UniProtKB/Swiss-Prot annotation, chain C:
N-terminally acetylated by acetyltransferase NatA. Also partially acetylated by NatC. Component of the small ribosomal subunit (SSU). Mature yeast ribosomes consist of a small (40S) and a large (60S) subunit. The 40S small subunit contains 1 molecule of ribosomal RNA (18S rRNA) and 33 different proteins (encoded by 57 genes). The large 60S subunit contains 3 rRNA molecules (25S, 5.8S and 5S rRNA) and 46 different proteins (encoded by 81 genes). Keywords: Acetylation, Cytoplasm, Isopeptide bond, Ribonucleoprotein, Ribosomal protein, Ubl conjugation. Component of the ribosome, a large ribonucleoprotein complex responsible for the synthesis of proteins in the cell. The small ribosomal subunit (SSU) binds messenger RNAs (mRNAs) and translates the encoded message by selecting cognate aminoacyl-transfer RNA (tRNA) molecules. The large subunit (LSU) contains the ribosomal catalytic site termed the peptidyl transferase center (PTC), which catalyzes the formation of peptide bonds, thereby polymerizing the amino acids delivered by tRNAs into a polypeptide chain. There is a cross-link at K33 (Glycyl lysine isopeptide (Lys-Gly) (interchain with G-Cter in ubiquitin)). This is Small ribosomal subunit protein uS10. It comes from the Eukaryota. Signal peptide: none annotated. The keyword Iron-sulfur does not apply. It is found in: Cytoplasm. Belongs to the universal ribosomal protein uS10 family. The lineage of its organism: Eukaryota, Fungi, Dikarya, Ascomycota, Saccharomycotina. The gene is RPS20.
UniProtKB/Swiss-Prot annotation, chain F:
Component of the small ribosomal subunit (SSU). Mature yeast ribosomes consist of a small (40S) and a large (60S) subunit. The 40S small subunit contains 1 molecule of ribosomal RNA (18S rRNA) and 33 different proteins (encoded by 57 genes). The large 60S subunit contains 3 rRNA molecules (25S, 5.8S and 5S rRNA) and 46 different proteins (encoded by 81 genes). This is Small ribosomal subunit protein eS19A. It is found in: Cytoplasm. Present with 29000 molecules/cell in log phase SD medium. There are 2 genes for eS19 in yeast. Belongs to the eukaryotic ribosomal protein eS19 family.
Curated annotation (Swiss-Prot), chain H:
This is Small ribosomal subunit protein eS28A. InterPro entries: NA-bd_OB-fold (IPR012340), Ribosomal_eS28 (IPR000289), Ribosomal_eS28_CS (IPR028626). Component of the ribosome, a large ribonucleoprotein complex responsible for the synthesis of proteins in the cell. The small ribosomal subunit (SSU) binds messenger RNAs (mRNAs) and translates the encoded message by selecting cognate aminoacyl-transfer RNA (tRNA) molecules. The large subunit (LSU) contains the ribosomal catalytic site termed the peptidyl transferase center (PTC), which catalyzes the formation of peptide bonds, thereby polymerizing the amino acids delivered by tRNAs into a polypeptide chain. Keywords: Acetylation, Cytoplasm, Ribonucleoprotein, Ribosomal protein. GO terms for biological process: maturation of SSU-rRNA; positive regulation of nuclear-transcribed mRNA catabolic process, deadenylation-dependent decay; ribosomal small subunit assembly; ribosomal subunit export from nucleus; translation. HAMAP family: Ribosomal_eS28. It is found in: Cytoplasm. PROSITE patterns: RIBOSOMAL_S28E. PANTHER family: 40S RIBOSOMAL PROTEIN S28, SMALL RIBOSOMAL SUBUNIT PROTEIN ES28. It comes from the Eukaryota. It comes from Saccharomyces cerevisiae (strain ATCC 204508 / S288c) (Baker's yeast). Its main location: cytoplasm. GO terms for cellular component: cytosol; cytosolic small ribosomal subunit.
Curated annotation (Swiss-Prot), chain J:
This is Small ribosomal subunit protein uS3. There is a cross-link at K18, K27, K37 (Glycyl lysine isopeptide (Lys-Gly) (interchain with G-Cter in ubiquitin)). Belongs to the universal ribosomal protein uS3 family. It is found in: Cytoplasm. The gene is RPS3. The chain holds residues 115 to 170 of 240 of the full protein. Component of the small ribosomal subunit (SSU). Mature yeast ribosomes consist of a small (40S) and a large (60S) subunit. The 40S small subunit contains 1 molecule of ribosomal RNA (18S rRNA) and 33 different proteins (encoded by 57 genes). The large 60S subunit contains 3 rRNA molecules (25S, 5.8S and 5S rRNA) and 46 different proteins (encoded by 81 genes). Component of the ribosome, a large ribonucleoprotein complex responsible for the synthesis of proteins in the cell. The small ribosomal subunit (SSU) binds messenger RNAs (mRNAs) and translates the encoded message by selecting cognate aminoacyl-transfer RNA (tRNA) molecules. The large subunit (LSU) contains the ribosomal catalytic site termed the peptidyl transferase center (PTC), which catalyzes the formation of peptide bonds, thereby polymerizing the amino acids delivered by tRNAs into a polypeptide chain. The lineage of its organism: Eukaryota, Fungi, Dikarya, Ascomycota, Saccharomycotina. Present with 146000 molecules/cell in log phase SD medium. The modification Phosphoserine is found at S15. The modification Omega-N-methylarginine is found at R32.
Length: 63, 139, 53, 206, 56, 143, 70, 63, 141, 56
RNA sequence: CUUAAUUGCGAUAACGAACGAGACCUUAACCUACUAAAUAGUGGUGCUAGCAUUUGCUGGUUAUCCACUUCUUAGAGGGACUAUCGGUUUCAAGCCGAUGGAAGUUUGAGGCAAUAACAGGUCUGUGAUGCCCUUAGACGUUCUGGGCCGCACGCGCGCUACACUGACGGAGCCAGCGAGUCUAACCUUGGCCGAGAGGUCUUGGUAAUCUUGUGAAACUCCGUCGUGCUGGGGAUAGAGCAUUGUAAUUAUUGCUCUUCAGCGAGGAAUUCCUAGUAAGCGCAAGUCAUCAGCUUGCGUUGAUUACGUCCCUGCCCUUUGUACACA
RNA sequence: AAUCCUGGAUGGAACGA
């Protein structure tokens, strides 16, 4: 099962809370930005966080 | 290869050395029907004799059969290498005889009874009817 | 895993890694003894040979 | 059709068929077609193939099995009973000889003969034990097309196996006569006998 | 001399372990934490990390 | 266009070259032939038996033409198989070394195979020419 | 150990008369007619393809496949 | 040899003791607009076609 | 110098390297012709890359293949993969990407692991069994 | 035993650990064994962070 | 409601925390982009062999070079995050399908793995150990020799098998995980002798370089059998030849010939298993002077059948009843 | 612009410490 965990969701929520005038809807540049911006200790977490931020950005743009 | 038209002189019980050797099969295994000889020995014998091994046993006229039997009972006289034999070195006389008869059973029994005479462990186990080649007798 | 025999027959593979490198250097001998007295480090074994022909 | 000779000499005689329309060097997956509706989804024909080895991943999701070629499924069903696990090559050769024989007898597409055998051996009704709570009865239920074709293949291969077992007749010969006597409703084959048994048992239990 | 690298490194490990047990049994009073070995040319040094450097 | 032993199927080439060696009648046959099993893990002698030495000779001639250097132990590995060890599981067992050794010696005698540097036996240029001409005749058969 | 090791006069005639009438001929068929055993079935099939009576479409051992000729 | 085909339109739910039987809503091409509920043994996709030996039936949920 | 490429095909162990240079038709394997490979069945499996394109697309080149590792079937699949990949590599580097797309479309409409390698690999063995998922037979008394 | 273990825990968490744990197993105040278990702060049991951080 | 998951959405007399799970680590799969590499390969050029000769084809070659790194090794990195699209869901967490992709069941397999307990196993692993016993015709230590293998029987793992998708005899040749000699005698190539096992003269390797392209088997090409307890099952048992070891006798093993048993698919009962898995097939290591039918791993060939249910055996949560609490 | 509608069950044996 592919349910995201609270570390991922909370980090994404924070990144949206304080870096919304950045963070395009694209996973790739969101990922590179996560690298630029957060001391994440693993590529896998970085990519999961980027994916969830992208998901939240999408369902922000549509409401 | 091609199909022959063999004729009804074919005999299909023709016997050698006190055993009803079957016919209508191949001669090597027909001979393995005999005691004391097996597939390897029979093939060697029928090779040393100039014989068509792709031919059944009810063929093989009697001079051929007796040449075969002579090779069997006196093998070393036809350059059979003497490691091929069964009762090699033969503690009665110290020569290499091939036991191909009911002599196989008689000599089996004689070996057992001389072991019993000298009171060998192998002979005592043979007496009681147990296993003797060094096996677990739990099963 | 167990000292004794009782239990589910559980196994354990321990493993050691051994990494190995080699370099070839066309050197004069003063630099050779300089570079053998340089670069000493724990946990690493160094071998040197000359005239590989 | 005009040959293309080449430094490495290809056999032109079969280069013809090679670079022509596609088939197992003999038999087309053109005019051959499944006689029956209801099971025109579970016979792969179109796509075609060359030979029935096809090291593919079909038993993965749910129905790529159904998209697999029936000939591969026959080889796969022949490859069983312990001493024949693996030996997909033996199975492919057996199928080669079997289709050769089904062409020799009954000049026809043996692919079509096999398909008719399958669709005529597929049992269209089967029994299941309902629960109840300790004393329940068999209930007649319908049978899906996929289970129809699977049980068909199983029955054919098992009949051929139990025939050829301890008999001079070769497994290819047994499979051939069984597929023939199943393409026709001969009622001499293990497959159709079992089909009739199951169907009338269901009729009894309804 | 002239020993394979596998057995060489296994021997290094067993040497470390034997030294560890030895200094554990001896330098108990002295707060023995651990050891380190550093092999060099001309010399091989053995560092002993312990609490107090008065008794050792 | 030119031909080699790599251009001909192995079974047909070995049959042709074994028949050629049998018709030429000049390799050797040792004398303890038709009195051996060819492997300790076998259970019967060969069934050809007015032969099988030209077959083994043709096979190792093609094998040496393929490789660089083979020795006797390599051929014992190559011609050995699974020994049925009665009621215990099977095992790979190398073939009879005396057969392969005497085949290699007879092929040195007829001049197909030469001794090699870096050990083992090598194909000779005479044997290379003979094998190529036999392969030419082999695929010449099908016209 | 049942039947038909060697023909010895007449199954030559029976073979040469009857086998061009079949649709499919192989060892198992010649035997399930309880004619010739398997060894002679192989031999006879080689003989008949030699003479050109039967049309062969086999390629290897352990399964022979012959039909009529025309 | 009267036999009736039937196209599946709604796979309903799995049914039976061990869960090896599936309830299916079927609509058959000759005289469509006459839907039935039946039970089936094997795998089913919807838009699949059945072969009913009898159509004068209607299954209940097996227990 | 002469135009050439080199590609590879894989199936579980068997890397089959394929050099493809400009030539005059010649196709060959471990040092022979593709008419003779093995085991008389899967010769059509190795021919498959040659026919779906149409044999005219080889007269101007020289394929040479070499294999190691695996078994007979694995090596067959490796060499057909290698032939296809070498062909499309040649048609990329020296012929137009349009014809490349055509060849790739054919080989991938077929796609029994012809360009893309089979991702399957052996699950390891684990204690308690002769194999990975299989377990020994327990008794209960 | 309580004084000893809690003194260790105090000294460690003063030294600046994220956490400690002291298990004392055996015969305490009786014959039948009992494992006392003392702790403070934080602790992990799983993963590579065990091999990295905790010292046992 | 959802998830493999007290995993989340969220609801809310609870708030904010910790452990576990997950994260993490290792391995397997992708990279014609980086760093390179006679201890891995390739190409070409010399020299050389055979066939063709008209260019060509298949080979060999250490001090012939020169160039390169696709294949092989690694080190640093990248890559997948269920991406995109469409459905479904209060429209949230999520789920389903297709597309592309090396890879779309937490990508696969594992490691680490909570609280509380069992009066589980183990004093025969420990110079880990309390108490008790024994402590110099000593259950201390050591030497000789036997036994741990002993048989009317019952049980549990397993190995061969009961045959023509099969045996045999020739022609089968394609693997991967490994290990290996110092004050030594290990892995052994090549040549020679011998039917065989194996013996002898040299050589290489302290190892990506030598054993070893571990040219393993199953498997494919040709034939011989031919349905018969048969030639395939290969137990017993006789005789002989070697090897290991001080010593092989109740046979250590290996080889040769002979003897050629039961077993024709196993009631009642019952195990394991859903994909490169089951099964078949062998190989290395472990123990080891020698001896595998064992185990641990490796690869080779590679199916059928579900993609569910709680009916049997059990597990988690909630509610409920209890005269139970070593439950 | 046509247009009549449906929710629903049971199912044997199982002693002891």
């Amino acid at each position: 099962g592919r349910v995201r965990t609270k570390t991922v969701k909370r980090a994404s929520k924070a990144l949206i809370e304080r870096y919304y005038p950045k963070l395009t809807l694209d996973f790739q540049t969101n990922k590179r930005l996560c690298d630029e911006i957060a001391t994440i200790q693993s590529k896998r977490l970085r990519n999961k966080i980027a994916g969830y931020t992208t998901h939240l950005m999408k369902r922000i743009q549509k409401g | 290869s091609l199909v022959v038209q063999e004729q009804g002189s074919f005999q299909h019980i023709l016997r050698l050395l006190n055993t009803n050797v079957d016919g209508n099969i191949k001669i090597v295994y027909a001979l393995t029907t005999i005691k004391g000889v097996g597939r390897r020995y029979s093939n060697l014998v029928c090779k040393k004799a100039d014989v068509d091994l792709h031919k059944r046993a009810g063929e093989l006229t009697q001079e051929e059969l007796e040449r075969i039997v002579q090779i069997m009972q006196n093998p070393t006289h036809y350059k059979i290498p003497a490691w091929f034999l069964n009762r090699q070195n033969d503690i009665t006389d110290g020569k290499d005889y091939h036991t191909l008869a009911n002599n196989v059973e008689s000599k089996l029994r004689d070996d057992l009874e001389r072991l019993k005479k000298i009171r060998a462990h192998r002979g005592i186990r043979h007496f009681w009817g147990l296993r003797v080649r060094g096996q677990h007798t739990k099963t | 895993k167990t000292p004794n025999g009782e239990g589910s027959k559980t196994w354990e593979t321990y493993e050691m890694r051994i990494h190995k490198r080699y370099i070839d250097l066309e050197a004069p001998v003063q630099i050779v003894k300089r570079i053998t007295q340089i670069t000493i480090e724990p946990g690493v074994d160094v071998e040197v040979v000359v005239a590989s022909n | 059709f005009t040959p293309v000779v080449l430094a490495t000499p290809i056999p032109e005689e079969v280069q013809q068929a090679q670079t022509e329309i596609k088939l197992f060097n003999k038999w087309s997956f053109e005019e051959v077609e499944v006689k029956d509706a209801s099971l025109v989804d579970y016979v792969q024909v179109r796509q075609p193939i060359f030979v029935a080895h096809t090291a593919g991943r079909y038993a993965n999701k749910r129905f790529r099995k159904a998209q697999c070629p029936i000939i591969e499924r026959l080889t796969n069903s022949l490859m069983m009973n312990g001493r024949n696990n693996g030996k997909k090559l033996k199975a492919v050769r057996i199928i080669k000889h079997t289709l050769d024989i089904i062409n020799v007898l009954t000049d026809q597409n043996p692919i079509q003969v096999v398909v008719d055998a399958i669709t005529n051996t597929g049992p269209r009704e089967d029994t299941t034990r309902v629960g109840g709570g300790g004393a329940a009865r068999r209930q007649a239920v319908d049978v899906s097309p996929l289970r129809r074709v699977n049980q068909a293949i199983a029955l054919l291969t098992i009949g051929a196996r139990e025939a050829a077992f301890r008999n001079i007749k070769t497994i290819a010969e047994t499979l051939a006569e069984e597929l023939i006597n199943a393409a026709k409703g001969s009622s001499t084959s293990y497959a159709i006998k079992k089909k009739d048994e199951l169907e009338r048992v269901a009729k009894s239990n309804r | 001399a002239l020993i394979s690298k596998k057995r060489k490194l296994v021997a290094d490990g067993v040497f470390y372990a034997e030294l560890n047990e030895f200094f554990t049994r001896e330098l108990a009073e002295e707060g023995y934490s651990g050891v380190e070995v550093r092999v060099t040319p001309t010399k091989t040094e053995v560092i002993i990390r312990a609490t107090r450097t008065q008794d050792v | 266009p030119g031909v080699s032993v790599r251009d001909v199927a192995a079974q047909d080439f070995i049959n042709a070259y074994a028949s050629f060696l049998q018709r030429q009648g000049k390799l050797e046959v040792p004398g303890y032939v038709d009195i051996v099993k060819t492997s300790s893990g076998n259970e019967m002698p060969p069934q050809d038996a007015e032969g099988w030495f030209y077959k083994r000779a043709a096979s190792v001639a093609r094998h040496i033409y393929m490789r660089k250097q083979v020795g006797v132990g390599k051929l014992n590995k190559l011609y050995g198989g699974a020994k049925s060890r009665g009621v215990r599981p099977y095992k790979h067992i190398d073939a009879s070394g005396s057969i392969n050794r005497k085949v290699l010696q007879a092929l040195e005698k007829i001049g197909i195979v030469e001794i090699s540097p870096k050990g083992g036996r090598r194909i000779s240029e005479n044997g290379q020419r003979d094998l190529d001409r036999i392969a030419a005749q082999t695929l010449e058969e099908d016209e | 150990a049942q039947h038909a090791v060697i023909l010895d006069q007449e199954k030559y005639d029976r073979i040469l008369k009857e086998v061009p009438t079949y649709r499919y001929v192989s060892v198992s068929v010649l035997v399930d007619r309880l004619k010739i055993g398997g060894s002679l079935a192989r031999i006879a099939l080689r003989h008949l393809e030699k003479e050109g009576i039967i049309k062969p479409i086999s390629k290897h051992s352990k399964q022979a496949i012959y039909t009529r000729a025309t | 040899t009267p036999v009736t085909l039937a196209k599946v339109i709604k796979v309903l739910g799995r049914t039976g003791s061990r869960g090896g039987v599936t309830q299916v809503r079927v609509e058959f091409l000759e005289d469509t607009s006459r839907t039935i509920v039946r039970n089936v043994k094997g795998p089913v996709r919807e838009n699949d076609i059945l072969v009913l030996m009898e159509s004068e039936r209607e299954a209940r949920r097996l227990r | 110098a002469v135009p050439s490429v080199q590609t590879f095909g894989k199936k579980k162990s068997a890397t089959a390297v394929a050099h493809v240079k400009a030539g005059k038709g010649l196709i060959k394997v471990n040092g022979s012709p593709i008419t003779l490979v093995e085991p008389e069945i899967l010769r059509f499996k190795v021919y498959e890359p040659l026919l779906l394109v149409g044999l005219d697309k080889f007269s101007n080149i020289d394929i040479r293949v070499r294999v190691t590792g695996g078994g007979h079937v694995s090596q067959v699949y490796a060499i057909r993969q290698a032939i296809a990949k070498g062909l499309v590599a040649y048609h990329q580097k020296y012929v137009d990407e349009q014809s490349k797309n055509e060849l790739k479309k054919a080989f991938t409409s077929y796609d029994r692991t012809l360009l893309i390698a089979d991702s399957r690999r052996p699950e390891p063995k684990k204690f308690g069994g002769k194999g990975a998922r299989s377990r020994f037979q327990k008794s209960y008394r | 035993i309580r004084r000893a273990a809690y003194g260790v825990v105090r000294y460690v968490m003063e030294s600046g650990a994220k956490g400690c744990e002291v298990v004392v197993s055996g015969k305490l105040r009786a014959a039948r064994a009992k494992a006392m278990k003392f702790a403070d702060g934080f602790l992990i049991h799983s993963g590579q962070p065990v091999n990295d951080f905790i010292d046992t």
